[PDB]
Amino acid sequence: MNYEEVIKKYRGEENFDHAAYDWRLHSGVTPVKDQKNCGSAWAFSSIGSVESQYAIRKNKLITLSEQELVDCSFKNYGCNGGLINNAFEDMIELGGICPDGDYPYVSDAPNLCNIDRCTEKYGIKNYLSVPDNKLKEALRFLGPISISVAVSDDFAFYKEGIFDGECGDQLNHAVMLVGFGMKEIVNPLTKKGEKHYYYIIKNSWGQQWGERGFINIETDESGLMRKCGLGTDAFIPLIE
Amino acid sequence: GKSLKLGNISNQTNQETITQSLSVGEILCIDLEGNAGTGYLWVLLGIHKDEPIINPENFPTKLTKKSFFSEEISVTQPKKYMQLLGGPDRMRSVIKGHKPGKYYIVYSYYRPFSPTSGANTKIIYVTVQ
């Protein structure tokens, strides 16, 4: 479906502050998880996006089963990688996902697909591709975005603040964009504060990594500055 | 030169020694396999004459930049090599003997922010002859 078509129904005519907006503060972000030693961030990113939509559009706090996507998503390759859109297409084809209480995550351990391990399931109606130049807008009115990114070995040493490591060569990981912010950093020479912009991102390396699971990555007031090729792939699940 | 590719990654913390015979001067290629975007990286942790006792509790939480260069031996820190996200991640280390001997070369795939969580350690037992 058209991004422009859908955006009209959610934006209206009003403008918006391009400096800051954080879904963690607007009932739009569920708890960080851990993909562990398994190339399955494509599942965490996607499921994550759906959990958000449920929290936002329906005030329902539900956490869903990545293990199921790992087991049951036949377009993707489980612990060995996958694609975000393949993940959504598979959610639709399966008629929704079990809650992770019913279908826990067991990473790389041999597990069989079994889509009747829960009675109630949560699905999406469709999904949407976001233009690399409408990230903040899509964030503001549509919610958190499942995106691709290019990570180097430096991300593993990231602890706090705005990321200042090398970027990656090629897209290779999935994460969630959950907002944007700006902090003023005082200029040594000037002793004046200076505005700095960043995207706020949800990773799946558990909560001992980064800012309790999240990382801040440099952007600009417009959100066109896309470090680490972030947002090259970008999708939002629609549940309504 | 002559080469060696490791190695089946598990979710439980483990060790794997693997012996390799080498003629002096001969160059040995270690091909290190993993998964992109998990937060694990391969780090060259040490060269020992003593059989090394492995404790992940004591691995570096920070970046380990120095490669290993001595009169007897030289070994390098592993380095690099719709897209597939989270696919196989190749990294390469270089081993070169300069003097006959026995050497314990230690590599590990671990998370700096959680070293005990499923560290896969590879000891190469190399003989320079």
HEC secondary structure over chain A:
CCHHHHHHHHHCCCCCCCCCEEHHHCCCCCCCCECCCCECHHHHHHHHHHHHHHHHHHCCCCCECHHHHHHHCCCCCCCECECHHHHHHHHHHHCCECECCCCCCCCCCCCCCCCCCCCCCECCCEEEECCCCCHHHHHHHHCCEEEEECCCHHHHHCCCCECCCCCCCCCCEEEEEEEEEEEEEECCCCCCEEEEEEEEEECCECCCCCECCEEEEECCCCCCCCHHHCCCCEEEEECC
Would you say A32 and A212 are in contact if contact means Cβ atoms under 8 Å apart?
A: yes
Final resolution, Å = 2.6
Distance CA A114, CA A231 (A): 32
Would you say A175 and A204 are in contact if contact means Cβ atoms under 8 Å apart?
A: yes
Q: Does A85 touch chain B (CB under 8 A)?
A: yes
Q: Does B118 touch chain A (CB under 8 A)?
A: yes
Contacts of B21 (CB under 8 A, 6+ apart): B126, B127, B129
- Quote the minimal CA–CA distance from B10 to chain A in Å: 8
Contact check, Cβ <8 Å, A148/B111: no
Q: Does A111 touch chain B (CB under 8 A)?
A: no
Contact check, Cβ <8 Å, A36/B38: yes
Range of the domain at A170: 1-240
Task: Give, in order, the Cα–Cα distances in Å from B104 to each of A40, A115, A170, B99, B127.
Answer: 34, 48, 34, 14, 9
Residues A46, B34, A34, CA angle at the centre, nearest 5°?
40
- Quote the minimal CA–CA distance from B117 to chain A in Å: 8
Distance CA A127, CA A120 (A): 21
Task: Give, in order, the Cα–Cα distances in Å from A28 to each of A22, A236, B103, B121.
Answer: 9, 13, 54, 40
Residue B121: which H helix or E strand, with range?
strand B120-128
Contact check, Cβ <8 Å, A42/B85: yes
Contact check, Cβ <8 Å, A80/B83: no
Chain B: residue whose CA lies nearest to A147 = B85
Would you say B77 and B43 are in contact if contact means Cβ atoms under 8 Å apart?
A: yes
Contact check, Cβ <8 Å, B37/A148: no
* Phi/psi of residue B35, nearest 5 degrees: -120, 130
Contact check, Cβ <8 Å, B37/A173: yes
Q: Does A79 touch chain B (CB under 8 A)?
A: yes
- CA end-to-end distance (rounded Å), chain A: 14
* CB interface of B with A, residues 13-32, below 8 Å: none
Question: Which residues does chain B have within 8 Å of residue A156's beta carbon, measured at their own beta carbons?
Answer: 39-41, 111-113
Would you say A155 and A178 are in contact if contact means Cβ atoms under 8 Å apart?
A: no
Rg (CA), chain A: 18
Task: Give, in order, the Cα–Cα distances in Å from A164 to each of A2, A161, A167, A182.
Answer: 35, 9, 9, 16
Distance CA B106, CA B101 (A): 16
Options 2.60.40.2020, 3.30.470.20, 1.20.1740.10, 3.40.50.720; CATH of B1-129: 2.60.40.2020
